[PDB]
């Protein structure tokens, strides 16, 4: 159904994000990089035996976007709610240790800026993980390992999602429908409010 800019922008973004192979990106997040003591050297030095930890990611999720327009009408902030499942494993004995639910929000800032030669550009300014949005939740005295783990995932990972997802956001933005972009730009640059 046809609608104003705010709601057009919302679906255009969802669609691009999905079609641009988000979900895939979320499913291939290099999580074992959140782990890089020397008890790791011991496993890597006994041939025929390694990695007593592994993390496969499952069930990527994009929830519905969210839109806010700055008070001076010059700025948009998109909220991008994400969700993954985490299965913590150990190849050595071969059984699941933890299955975890993780939710998280990226927010992208959208700007119009008039250049040098009287052109206007639609730009992705800031694009961060949203502080306070990281939320782990559990699905054998694992709690020693749970609180060590969910602790680790708290500065590593939001910066990891951010780094993997924002470039896609950058891409979906530029690839947007030309008239939609042209309309958005001219409302943002003139402070005209459309988001509601």
| Alpha carbon distance 141, 144 (integer Å) | 7
> Looking at residue 156, what DSSP letter applies?
T
Residues 89, 55 contacting (CB under 8 angstroms): yes
Q: How was this structure determined?
A: X-ray
Kindly give, in sequence order, each residue whose CB lies less than 8 Å from that of residue 110, ignoring residues fewer than 6 positions away: 75, 76, 77, 78, 122, 123, 124, 125, 173, 184, 188
Kindly give, in sequence order, each residue whose CB lies less than 8 Å from that of residue 65, ignoring residues fewer than 6 positions away: 10, 13, 14, 78, 79, 80, 81
Domain boundaries, the chain: 1-196
Architecture of the 1-196 domain: Super Roll (3.15)
CB atoms within 10 A of CB 154: 12
- This structure's resolution (angstroms)? 2.5
């Amino acid at each position: 159904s046809p609608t104003g800019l705010a709601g057009s922008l919302t679906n255009a973004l969802s669609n691009g994000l999905l079609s641009g192979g988000l979900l895939g990106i979320l499913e291939n997040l290099p999580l074992l990089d959140c782990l890089k003591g020397l008890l790791g050297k011991v496993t890597s030095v006994i041939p025929g035996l390694n990695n007593i930890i592994d993390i496969k990611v499952t069930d990527p999720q994009l929830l519905e976007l969210g839109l806010v327009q700055s008070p001076d009408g010059h700025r948009l902030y998109v909220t991008i709610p994400l969700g993954i499942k985490l299965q913590v494993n150990t190849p050595l004995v071969g059984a699941s240790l933890l299955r975890l639910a993780v939710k998280l929000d990226i927010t992208a800032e959208i700007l119009a800026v008039r250049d040098k030669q009287e052109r206007i550009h639609l730009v992705l300014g800031d694009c961060t993980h949203s502080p306070g949005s990281l939320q782990i939740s559990l699905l054998l005295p694992i709690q020693g390992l749970l609180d060590s783990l969910t602790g680790i995932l708290n500065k590593c990972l939001p910066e990891l999602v951010q780094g993997n997802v924002c470039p896609l956001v950058n891409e979906v933005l530029r690839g947007l429908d030309i008239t939609l972009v042209h309309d958005i730009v001219n409302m943002l640059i003139h402070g005209l409010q459309f988001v509601i």
